[PDB]
Amino acid sequence: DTKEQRILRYVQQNAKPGDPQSVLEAIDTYCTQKEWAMNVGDAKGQIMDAVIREYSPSLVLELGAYCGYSAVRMARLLQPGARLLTMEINPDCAAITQQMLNFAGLQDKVTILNGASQDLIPQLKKKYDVDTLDMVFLDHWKDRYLPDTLLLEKCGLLRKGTVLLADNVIVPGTPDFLAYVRGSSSFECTHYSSYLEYMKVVDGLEKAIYQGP
Ligand SMILES: Cn1ncc2cc([C@H](O)c3cccc(CNC(=O)c4cc(-c5ccc(F)cc5)cc(O)c4O)c3)ccc21
Ligand SMILES: [Cl-]
Ligand SMILES: [Cl-]
Ligand SMILES: [Mg+2]
């Protein structure tokens, strides 16, 4: 099997169904003790939690589901009725993420879309009945952070106060995105220094709040 299948099985066998916290803990244990994986992890995850709690977003878009770690992490903190949409291009990972969400009992809160962000973003308004997004979590290919931020704006999906939160702004890094948002009058940016998941390597999140045109 694959690493991602092994992570899912480990959760199924070491967490409690319907208990998101147990699911996170199981993933973090597996990835610390058995096999590293590109989940956002607990260090950066704690920062994400603090941001979700601050903003209590009603509608979150995630770009880059992977195995569903961050989707579990965010969705468990959403208020009743709030929703997460997550985009994943890799069909095997989309299926893992769905199964992970199902195990966690969060499937009613989350919609996992299997496809490329640049193809799905233009469909959000008409096909998924989105007006504007409260928060966006960027965690897909690092060279897509900037193009997809610009596409979200073009498609009318950002409003005053939309929170963009970007993983991996140091490692692997997303230099064009970071330069752009930090140089733009349309964003108010904050850097949250942290560590790469499961590693003693500095990484960080960037929060960029959209201010309108
Ligand atoms: C277009 N589109 N639309 C939806 C969508 C979804 C995907 C996949 O979810 C996918 C697959 C492969 C890689 C990524 C990005 N993630 C990373 O590359 C990453 C790397 C590292 C790291 C760090 C140190 C290392 F040494 C090696 C890897 C640490 C991290 O936290 C990461 O997030 C995302 C891809 C394109 C997509
Ligand atoms: Cl993740
Ligand atoms: Cl960690
Ligand atoms: Mg990441």
CATH number at residue 117: 3.40.50.150
| Ligand 1 close to Cβ of residue 96 (< 6 A) | no
Q: Which of 197, 203, 206, 207 is catalytic?
A: 197
Method: X-ray
Rounded to whole angstroms, how far apart are CA atoms 54 and 76? Answer: 14
| C-alpha span between 123 and 56 (Å, rounded) | 25
Number of domains in the chain: 1
Ligand nearest to the CA of 37: 1
Ligand 1: which atom is nearest the Cα of residue 141? 15
Domain membership of residue 116 as a residue range: 1-213
Q: How long, in residues, is the chain?
A: 213
Instruction: Determine the distance separating the centroid of ligand 1 and the alpha carbon of 155, expressed in angstroms.
Output: 24
Cα of 130 vs centre of ligand 1, distance in Å, is 25
Q: Is 132 exposed, middle or buried (0-12, 13-18, 19+ CB in 10 A)?
A: middle
Are the C-beta atoms of residues 211 and 185 closer than 8 Å to each other? yes
- In Å, how far are 23, 138, 195 from 17, measured between CA atoms? 8, 27, 29
Tell me, in Å, the resolution of the deposited structure: 1.2
